[PDB]
Design a protein around this ligand. Structure first.
Ligand code: AGS
Ligand code: MG
Lengths: 65, 281, 298
């Protein structure tokens, strides 16, 4: 009765958003304000802002009521 | 996230006809409520006059949230205006005056968003006497629960600004054909204000509103960005999805095209008739 | 009018919770009335409402209803018989590795959903992990929970129960990510494995001292760029106790989970998703089914 991890498929009605790690080497983070060293001392990485902006940009595009 | 939100589930309607149905139903409900309790008095407002007064008081809501002494973030203003739109989608202007509901929507948007403002500050942002500020605060607190009930306790509003920024990031990244997409930023701010003036917030997703603003700015500036839709969004293959998105964008652009701002004489007459309706309850 | 009170469950400093039953579905719920100057509806109640209205997961509490009357409101959640604190503190019922794995799995699945929705449960502790008779763990209260994505937002460093506070929050980080929830989850797992609060601090300085003397002070190669936080103070270099000495009866995979959840660098700290992908949850002792989890009887 073991456990297998499933990636929590939640269906966003929009274009695919690249993963958070595969996000600075696609070029996105060049166009996001760099996180300050103090901010980086916490959990903030300036790719959270990029990833949230991209997820809200593509959240519902392929959807109308 | 919008795709799971209550804004998608409940407050996103299929056509302007459904919006007009809801508003005419609210107006008719108030009219029948007034008639059945002690039958065609011209004191009442029509649904289109109610819409004119709603447009006027949404303009005043933008003006208030723009001169707010602490710099109100634009998400808070968008949330307050969305609350105004919904509240008067399902409620009649003659029951609840739009100035008090204007201030109440601003208040609840300041609280639901985490723009932390004390009540004395919030009423100090009102161009009334301290007595008038105290009374306005009393009315706001009276009407706050009513506003939250009339929103069906759906307090999270998704504004097109964050999808606008995310589209700009993706556009600077994967769309090298476009250089310096910030000219688009200025013109799309203009179009986004224009489109916030209309009822498109209840009809399209914030992502679609942001994309329409961006592509409208491109079209005004002579840039073609069909390669950003077909490619870089992979609408080259699901042609039906591409045409569906284009229809959404064209519909919403036309919706901004046909918007007629509230007048100056008509708004004066409507304000006077509304205050006569409120005085004689 | 639609809900009848059944029991006087208790109070929090901003709510009165009564067990209740609805006359429409004869389902047992928990109604939460909020108390009452010149500010209006309490912001913790509005935060509950606004955040729980747009979440629907098995392992997050859901407000089945919300209503109210003059100047006051009442929320209506699933009724949850216990929390994880009464399960931890009850000496009668044992917590086998499978039971611990079940609680951790439910907690991290709920928190993974909550983090994929860019919401941060900034107060995670065994008190706030309720669970029903079906043994389904739910994240309890969202009266201090936020959205952690936007840069333009200045958070507050004081918001999580001290015992379950990450080092960066004690150092005064006004900006943070999912590391605060994950540190509180590591502390919950440690309390679940020891049955006593891991790192019980008397103050922020004492909490930091206990964190550092239990895990070792970070050396700026483990938590690089640490010295920039607003309330950073240098500490005596503690060696820290090896994890296989604090939890003398935890498997190697569980030790790796502990190490990941207790990384000082709030960016190297594992997230709920990659915590769920670790060998601990996939190894031989499966999590217990919610039907076989122990319930504290009376
Ligand atoms: N969903 C629920 N089902 C059943 N009982 C609940 C539920 N939520 C809360 N309770 C109970 O109600 C009590 C008070 O509610 P809380 O959630 O603790 O409010 P609170 O403000 O967090 O309390 P404090 O501040 O920690 S003392 C809790 O201690 C539980 O015993
Ligand atoms: Mg409590």
């Amino acid at each position: 009765a073991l456990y297998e991890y499933q990636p929590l498929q939640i269906e966003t009605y929009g274009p695919h958003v690249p993963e958070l790690e595969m996000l600075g080497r696609l070029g996105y983070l060049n166009h996001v304000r760099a996180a300050s060293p103090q901010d980086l001392a916490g959990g903030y990485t300036s790719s959270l802002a990029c990833h949230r902006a991209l997820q809200d940009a593509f959240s519902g595009l392929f959807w109308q009521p | 996230m919008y795709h799971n939100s209550s804004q998608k589930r409940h407050w996103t309607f299929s056509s302007e006809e459904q919006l007009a149905r809801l508003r005419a139903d609210a107006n008719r409900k108030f009219r029948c409520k007034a008639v059945a309790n002690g039958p065609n008095d011209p004191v009442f407002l029509e649904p289109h006059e109610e819409m004119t007064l709603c447009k006027y008081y949404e303009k005043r809501l933008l003006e208030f949230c723009s001169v707010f002494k602490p710099a109100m973030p634009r998400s808070v203003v968008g949330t307050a205006c969305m609350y105004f739109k919904r509240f008067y989608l399902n409620n009649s202007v003659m029951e609840y005056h739009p100035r008090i509901i204007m201030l109440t929507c601003a208040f609840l948007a300041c609280k639901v968003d985490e723009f932390n403002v004390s009540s004395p500050q919030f009423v100090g942002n009102l161009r009334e006497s301290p007595l008038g500020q105290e009374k306005a605060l009393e009315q706001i607190l009276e009407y706050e629960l009513l506003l939250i009930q009339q929103l069906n306790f759906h307090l999270i509003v998704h504004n097109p600004y964050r999808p606008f920024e995310g589209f700009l990031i993706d556009l600077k990244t994967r769309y090298p054909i476009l250089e310096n997409p910030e000219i688009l930023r200025k013109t799309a701010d203009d179009f986004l204000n224009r489109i916030a003036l209309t009822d498109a917030y209840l009809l399209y997703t914030p992502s679609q509103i942001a994309l329409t603003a961006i592509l409208s700015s491109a079209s005004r500036a002579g840039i073609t960005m069909e390669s950003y839709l077909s490619e870089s969004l992979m609408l080259k293959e699901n042609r039906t999805c591409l045409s569906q998105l284009l229809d959404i964008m064209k519909s919403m652009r036309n919706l901004v095209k046909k918007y007629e701002p509230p007048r100056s004489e008509e708004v004066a007459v409507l304000k006077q008739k509304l205050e006569r309706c409120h005085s004689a309850e | 009018k639609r809900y009848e009170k059944l029991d006087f469950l208790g109070e929090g400093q901003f709510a009165t919770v009564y067990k209740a039953r609805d006359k429409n579905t004869n389902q047992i719920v928990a109604i939460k009335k909020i108390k009452l100057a010149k500010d209006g509806i309490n912001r913790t109640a509005l935060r509950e409402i606004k955040l729980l209205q747009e979440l629907s997961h098995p392992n997050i509490i859901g407000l089945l209803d919300a209503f109210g009357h003059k100047s006051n409101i009442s929320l209506v959640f699933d009724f949850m018989e216990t929390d994880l604190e009464v399960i931890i503190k009850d000496n009668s019922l044992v917590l086998t590795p499978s039971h611990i794995k079940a609680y951790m799995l439910m907690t991290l699945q709920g928190l993974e959903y909550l983090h994929q929705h860019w919401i941060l449960h900034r107060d995670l502790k065994p008190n706030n992990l309720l669970l029903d008779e079906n043994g389904v763990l739910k994240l309890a209260d969202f009266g201090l929970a936020k959205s952690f994505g936007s840069p333009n937002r200045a958070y507050t460093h004081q918001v999580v129960t001290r015992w379950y506070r990450a080092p960066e929050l004690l150092f005064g980080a006004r900006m943070y990510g999912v590391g605060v929830d994950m540190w509180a989850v590591g502390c919950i797992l440690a309390e679940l494995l020891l049955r006593v609060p891991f790192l019980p601090g008397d103050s922020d300085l004492d909490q930091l001292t206990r964190i550092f003397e239990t895990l070792g002070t970070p050396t700026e190669e483990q938590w690089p760029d640490m010295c920039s936080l607003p309330d950073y103070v240098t500490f005596k270099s503690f060696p820290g106790i090896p994890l296989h000495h604090i939890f003398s009866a935890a498997g190697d995979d569980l030790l790796d989970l502990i190490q990941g959840l207790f990384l000082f660098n709030p960016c190297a700290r594992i997230t709920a998703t990659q915590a769920l992908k670790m060998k601990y949850f996939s190894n031989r002792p499966g999590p217990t089914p919610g039907c076989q989890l122990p319930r504290p009887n009376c």
